[PDB]
Design a protein around this ligand. Structure first.
Ligand code: MG
Ligand code: MG
Ligand code: MG
Ligand code: MG
Ligand code: MG
Ligand code: MG
Ligand code: MG
Ligand code: MG
Ligand code: MG
Ligand code: MG
Ligand code: MG
Ligand code: MG
Ligand code: MG
Ligand code: MG
Ligand code: MG
Ligand code: MG
Ligand code: MG
Ligand code: MG
Ligand code: MG
Ligand code: MG
Ligand code: MG
Lengths: 141, 85, 135
RNA sequence: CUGCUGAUAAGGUCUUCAAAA
RNA sequence: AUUGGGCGUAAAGCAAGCGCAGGCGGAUUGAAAAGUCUGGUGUUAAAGGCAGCUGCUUAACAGUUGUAUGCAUUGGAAACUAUUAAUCUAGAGUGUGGUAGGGAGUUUUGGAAUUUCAUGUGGAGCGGUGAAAUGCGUAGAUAUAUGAAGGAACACCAGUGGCGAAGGCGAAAACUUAGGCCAUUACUGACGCUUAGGCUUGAAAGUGUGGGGAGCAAAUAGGAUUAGAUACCCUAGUAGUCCACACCGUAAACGAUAGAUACUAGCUGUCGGGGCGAUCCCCUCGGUAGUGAAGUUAACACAUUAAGUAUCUCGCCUGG
């Protein structure tokens, strides 16, 4: 796939993606691109699994020195998205660590909470099933 | 329900049955208005006027008063609102 | 503001001041030191009795007294009653309060507990004014 | 077409109510 | 207001910059395991709290059983932060090539105009105001023509404009010098953002020493107006305004809006580089403006140069 515009990204990997997603949702935009990091790749994989996005697709330069991830939002026929809001918890500076006992439940289970405990990012329900917790990245509902 | 002949400057949200069309050409507006009237007249059962018709009966003339000019002009009558002190 | 900013300079809470400061000062009288011990009501001795005028809207003559407490503070105190036996030199027992008409007055005199006589000719709300039950 | 031109004691009403016809 | 607030107009963004320490920080690989998660063990005195029960005529109360939190040690997890060992170019710099500027300092030069002086013509007023009067004038004023001296500021160009971080920068030239924009198949390889403390600059007024002084003019004197006028008007007028060297360090120092980074409709101008080659106009990258939906706001309004969606750092606010 060929591009024309330069691609930049913020230094904060969770909130960069969150800002991109929120702006695309508010502006009804469908496809967005950003620089690819492995945390972002895993988080997009779990978003696609949970069904908040249509597809995410990683690409590499011809010299294998740069990688960028482009993803599309899942709009219905009447063009209203599945994402309703995003809020980041573990911002730089103040990192949020919660044990299993205090693993949050987002919107009474309607939304999902992204938790990167020890096996990569992990949804709240599967984290509860595994009885182990860790860093809490963002709230998506 | 409201149907309309949107002409590139209309808000699509307000109209339900959008008909992308011209609004400045007295031939295009006539053709489309008569097509809607033809739908109405066929439903209420008289013979049609423009719909389901050949060229020899669809043909129309251009009102008086090279090619036709659908160009929007007269921007000079848009001055800055009265201001300054 | 910012986590680092609050870590460096934490949130300082606004202070709280009392409404009757003169009732919370205790003088030892042997070492001659004043300590902050809270007391509900305190005994004082009057120096000058008289009348003052209420501030803007009210118009009257309200009975005040310049009373010096068991400590070394002299306060202006309103006598809450109709008629008084204060004779410019007596022992009274002040409690907290605040009459709105007179500026500077922030204490009241309990009626009929000590040298100051109670308020007779009262059958309503007398327990506040120190009046014996008619029976 | 630009002269001059200063001040006005204090406190105050006036909305009772929609429950409802 | 960590959970849980704000700084355009209501209290609150330092006047601006260079910035050490601190806080935060691009992508990939390996190790360890300081943070993080989890298992075992020891302990966290009793009483108190919560749940259950018994006994006092039930209760209050008494008794009884269960019931957490943190620390330490040991055993695992390796996703994220920190440490270490390295690779990469996309952030930031450097080089080469295009290039626009009233960016700054030092030294020279120029022309209008005011004033004074000199020399001719001339003869009763000039000046000033709402109206006048102080004032200047037959010792020849105002006016007119020529010349000289000196000081300060640089018409037109001049803008629905340019440069700098801010204050600020506009007659001409030389010398020294600062930053910026565009394109890079080149190089270093995270060297970056913010910045308590520190340093640098900072309108005008003001200070000290020495020069300079044409015009203007605080203080001051007089004439008017006025009930009064220590003010508005007029006639004079010192400091000052000007230069060099040292201080002062404040402004409605304002976009009343800190800096950096990523994203979010469009339309109309204008300025610079680059692509084509008459101008004009088209495209790309940036600067500076207007209008304007989503979005925000108490409203006014802001609206890709945000007061919108978010992050980082600093400063500041807590009724009059
Ligand atoms: Mg008059
Ligand atoms: Mg008077
Ligand atoms: Mg508040
Ligand atoms: Mg303010
Ligand atoms: Mg500012
Ligand atoms: Mg300020
Ligand atoms: Mg800097
Ligand atoms: Mg540093
Ligand atoms: Mg990283
Ligand atoms: Mg215990
Ligand atoms: Mg007990
Ligand atoms: Mg001359
Ligand atoms: Mg000065
Ligand atoms: Mg005088
Ligand atoms: Mg006047
Ligand atoms: Mg004068
Ligand atoms: Mg002086
Ligand atoms: Mg100030
Ligand atoms: Mg200014
Ligand atoms: Mg606007
Ligand atoms: Mg106060």
């Amino acid at each position: 796939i060929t591009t024309t515009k330069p691609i930049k990204a913020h230094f904060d990997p969770v909130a960069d993606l969150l800002t991109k997603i929120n702006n695309a949702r508010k502006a009804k935009l469908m496809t967005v691109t950003t620089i690819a990091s492995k945390l972002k790749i895993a988080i997009l994989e779990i978003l696609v699994k949970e069904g908040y996005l249509a597809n995410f697709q990683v690409l590499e330069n011809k010299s294998k020195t740069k990688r960028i991830v482009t993803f599309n939002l899942k709009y219905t026929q009447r063009r209203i998205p599945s994402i309703n809001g995003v809020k980041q918890i573990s911002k730089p500076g103040l990192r949020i660590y919660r044990p299993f006992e205090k693993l949050p439940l987002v919107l009474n289970g309607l939304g999902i909470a992204i938790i990167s405990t020890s096996d990569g990012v992990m949804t709240d329900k599967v984290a509860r099933l595994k009885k182990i917790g860790g860093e809490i990245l963002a709230y998506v509902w | 329900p409201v149907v309309a002949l949107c002409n590139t400057n209309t808000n699509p949200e307000l109209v339900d049955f959008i008909i992308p069309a011209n609004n400045h050409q007295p031939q295009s507006t006539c053709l489309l208005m008569n097509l809607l009237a033809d739908a109405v007249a066929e439903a209420k059962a008289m013979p049609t006027m423009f719909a389901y018709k050949p060229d020899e009966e669809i043909q129309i003339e251009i009102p008086q008063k090279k090619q036709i000019t659908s160009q929007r002009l007269n921007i000079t009558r848009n001055p800055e609102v009265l201001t300054r002190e | 503001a910012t986590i680092a900013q609050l870590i460096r300079k934490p949130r300082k809470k606004k202070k709280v001041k009392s409404k009757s400061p003169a009732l919370h000062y205790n003088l030892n009288l042997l070492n001659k030191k004043v300590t902050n011990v809270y007391s509900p009501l305190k005994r004082g001795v009057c120096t000058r009795v008289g009348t003052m005028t209420p501030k803007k809207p009210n118009s009257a003559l309200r009975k005040y007294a310049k009373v010096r407490l068991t400590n070394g503070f002299e306060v202006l105190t309103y006598i809450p009653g109709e008629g008084h036996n204060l004779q410019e030199h007596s022992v009274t027992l002040l409690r907290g309060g605040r009459v709105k008409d007179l500026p500077g007055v922030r204490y009241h005199i309990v009626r009929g507990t000590l040298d100051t006589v109670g308020v007779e000719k009262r059958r309503q709300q007398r327990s506040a004014y120190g009046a014996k039950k008619p029976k």
